[PDB]
From a paper:
Previous work has demonstrated that one particular kinase, known as cyclic guanosine-3′,5′-monophosphate (cGMP)-dependent protein kinase, or protein kinase G (PKG), has essential roles in multiple stages of the parasite life cycle. Selective pharmacological inhibition of Plasmodium falciparum PKG (PfPKG) blocks the egress of merozoites and gametes from erythrocytes, as well as inhibits the motility of ookinetes in the mosquito and invasion of hepatocytes by sporozoites.
To overcome stability issues of PKG in the presence of cGMP, we produced isolated CNBs to capture cGMP-dependent conformational changes in other CNBs. As such, we report the cocrystallized PfCNB-A structure bound to cGMP, which illustrates the reorganization of helix αCA upon cGMP activation. This clearly suggests a mechanism by which conformational modifications induced by binding of cGMP to one CNB could be relayed to adjacent domains. The conformational alteration of this connecting helix is expected to make a significant contribution to kinase activity, as it makes important interactions with the kinase activation loop (K157–Y694 π-bond stabilization). The torsion of the connecting helix αCA is reminiscent of cAMP-dependent activation by PKA, which uses a similar mechanism to destabilize the extended αCA helix to uncouple CNB-A and -B before dissociation of the complex.
Numbering used by the authors: 21 to 158
Write the structure that this text describes.
């Protein structure tokens, strides 16, 4: 019970903003999914399904998105802003709009392998693990 509201589902819920997707949002989600090295083999219907279940998440500078060693619950596409990747406390890259992340824990069914921080204010499209894994499990 002490652990019920710790974890990605609780954290991301706190960053959710209800939003109608605009044409440019749909377009960018589709191109970004064609660009993830796990989703590059998805067909257009699989992409459309993922896109339908994407939600909008808003972050301020220095907010944590993913923490290395935790259970993963989401796959993300960067919509705006800059997100840094840290592997064992060393920053390995900075990602911007169109990049995606969070697939590895979900595919391998393992802990998050890096920490991702909003370096600037930024926004993400995120889909829950259930939909993501189901789309790949075929
Ligand atoms: N481990 C690792 N993850 C990275 C790297 N660059 C981007 N990532 C992403 O950071 C994510 C952290 O959560 P996941 O392990 O689910 O998936 C990881 C990748 O999508 C990298 O160089 N190493």
């Amino acid at each position: 019970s002490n652990d019920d509201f710790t974890g990605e589902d609780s954290l991301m819920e706190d960053h959710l903003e209800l939003r109608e997707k605009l044409s440019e949002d749909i377009d960018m989600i589709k191109t970004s999914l064609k660009n993830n090295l796990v989703c590059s083999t998805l067909n257009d219907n699989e992409i459309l399904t993922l896109s339908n279940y994407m939600q909008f998440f808003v972050f301020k500078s220095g907010n944590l998105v993913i923490k290395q060693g935790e259970k993963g619950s989401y796959f993300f596409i960067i919509n705006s802003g800059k997100f840094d990747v840290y592997v064992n406390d060393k920053k390995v890259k900075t990602m911007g709009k169109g990049s995606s992340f969070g697939e590895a824990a979900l595919i391998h069914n393992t802990q998050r392998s890096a920490t991702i921080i909003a370096e600037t204010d930024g926004t993400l499209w995120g889909v829950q693990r259930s939909t993501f894994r189901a789309t790949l499990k075929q």
